[PDB]
C-alpha cells in the first residue's frame, strides 16, 4: 500500500528489497513504431526482456524500476507480460522525455495540463489500465534547460507535491543540466531526497557529482556498461572514490540497460566498441566484486541497493 | 493506374478530377496519443472527418490529398474507415514531418535508410496494409534547414527519383525555407514540376512566391481560413494578383483543414480569434466566388483544382 507495481498489489517501501533503480525493458520511438511497424519484432523484444529480468533475479534482484515514459515508448501491457513471465517487482513511471521541444500537442497548454497527465497516471492508471505510476521521469541533455524542458520539470514538481512520488531524471553529465534540474525542482518545493539526478556516472568530475549530493539528492551512477559515455574502469574508480569520501547514502547504481532499443547507435556491429559488456547484470559480474576487493564493506552494498531505494520511495 | 488511393484501386491521373491538394482528416502527436489515450475520442474524430468530407463532396470535390505523415499521426486504418463512410478518393502519403531533430531512432542512420522507409510505404504499403503512398511529405519551419531537416529532404529526393511520386512540403513563408527546400531537391535531381512548396499563401510577398514558381514548382496557397497566418482577404488579393500575373499554371489552393487536431492552439475557444471561417469548404464559400466576380473564369478555376493536381501526379 505505497509503491504501485505493474501487475501486482502495491507494496510497502520497506519491502522493495535489492533494487535496480534504472533499467529499460524496451525503448522505442513512438512515432517511428506507429508509422513503420515492419521495423520491429515484438517476439524478440519479449524474449530479450524476459531473459534479462530472469538473470537479474538469479543474482538476487527483487525490484526493477523502469523509467521508460513518453518519448521512450512506454507500454504498460508489454510490461505486464514481462512481469507475468518472471514474477519481478516492476515499478513503472510517468513523465516526458524530451531534449528540446514538447510534442505539438502541448502548444498553448499550461504546466498544469502537463502535470495533470502525470497525476492521471499516478492516481488513475497508465494507458487505460489500473497499473499506476510510482514516480515521474524527466530529461534534459546537450541542448540544456530549454523552455519546454523547464515546463516539464515544473510539471513533475507539481505531481510530486500532489502525490508524493519521487522524481528520476536523465541529465547530461557535462553541461550542468543535472544541477539545474535539482535547483528548479527544489525551488518548486520538491524535497531534495525525492530526486535522483541521472547519468552523473557518465563523468569522472567528482566535484560536480558531489555538488548534487551535497544539496540532498541521490546521484545516478547509473549507466554501467555504456563505455561510450564513460568506461567501466573509470566509473568504478569514481564510484569507489565517492564511497570513500562518505557519499554511499546518496549513491544509486544501475545500468540503464535496454533489453531492446531501436536507435541506430545500438546496431550489433557497434556493441564491441561502444558497450561490449553492457547488460542488466554487469554490476554483479564486475562492479560489486570490484568494490568488495577494494575495501568496501557489505553494509555499503546494502545501503546503495536496498536502503537508498527504500528511502527514495518512502 | 498510377495514383494509389486509400481503400480503392489506383487511378490514372487524368481521372483525379476536382482535388483538394492539402487537407487533414485527423492530426495528432503519436507519442501523446499512445501514452494518454484518455485525451482522445475516436468516435468524435471519425464523425468530424466524415461530415467535412461529405460536405466537400457535395460541393464537387472528387479527390483529397492528405499529407498527414510521421509526426502528424498518420493512421491508414482511420483513413480507410473514412473512405468507406464517404466514397472519397483519398491519396495518402509517406514522409517525415519535423522542425528540428529526427526521432532518436534515426541516431546514426543514413539518409538511405530514411529513404527506404518512404520507398517501403510507396511500393509495399502503409502500416502493414496494402494501401500505398502516392507522394512524400517533408517539412521545415521557423528553425530553418537544420541538419536533420536537410536529411529528410534528401531522403525525399531519393524516394522521388526511385518511384517518381511527387513531393509536398510544409514550409515557413517568412524565412526562405520553401526556396531552400526547392533548391536542395532540384540540386539532388528532382524535377521542379514534381514539387509543391507549401504554405506560401501565408505571405503576401509575391516576389518571393514568384521566385519559387519561376523555378518550376507548384506554389501552395494552401491555408485558406487560417487567419492567424494570413487573413482570407489578403490571401485572396495575393491569389488574384498571381493569377493576373499569369501564374495559374503553378498555383495550388487548399485549406490545410484538420477535421480534428489535438494541439492546444486549436481549443474551440480560440477558433473565433485564430481561424473563424476555417473549414474544408471555405474556398467554395469565399475564395472561388471572390475570384469569379473579379473576372477570373471557370477555366482558371479548372486549371488550379483539376489540371495542376493532374500534372503534379503525372
Ligand atoms: Co537517460
Ligand atoms: Co504544413
Ligand atoms: Fe534510461
Ligand atoms: Fe498540413
Author numbering:
A (entry chain C), B (entry chain A): 1 to 314
What does the paper say about this structure?
Noteworthy, subtle changes, such as W263L or W263I, yield to a large tradeoff in catalytic activities. However, whereas detergent-induced flexibility has no effect on the lactonase activity, we isolated variants of W263 that exhibit increased lactonase activities (W263T/V/I). These variants exhibit dramatic improvement of their oxo-lactonase catalytic efficiencies (148-fold for variant W263T), while the activity for the best AHL substrate is compromised (3-oxo-C10 AHL; for the wild-type enzyme). Conversely, the LacSV group dramatically increases oxo-lactonase activity and 3-oxo-C12 AHLase activities, while the phosphotriesterase activity is mildly modulated and 3-oxo-C10 AHLase is decreased. The residues selected in the LacSV group (T, V, I) are overall smaller than those selected in the PteSV group (F, L, M) with the exception of isoleucine (I). The analysis of the normalized B-factors of the variants clearly reveal that the substitution W263 is destabilizing (as confirmed by the Tm of the variants), but also that the active site loops of PteSV are significantly more disordered than those of LacSV. PteSV lose their activity before the loss of the global structure (Tm), whereas LacSV do not, and exhibit a similar thermophilicity profile to that of the wild-type enzyme.
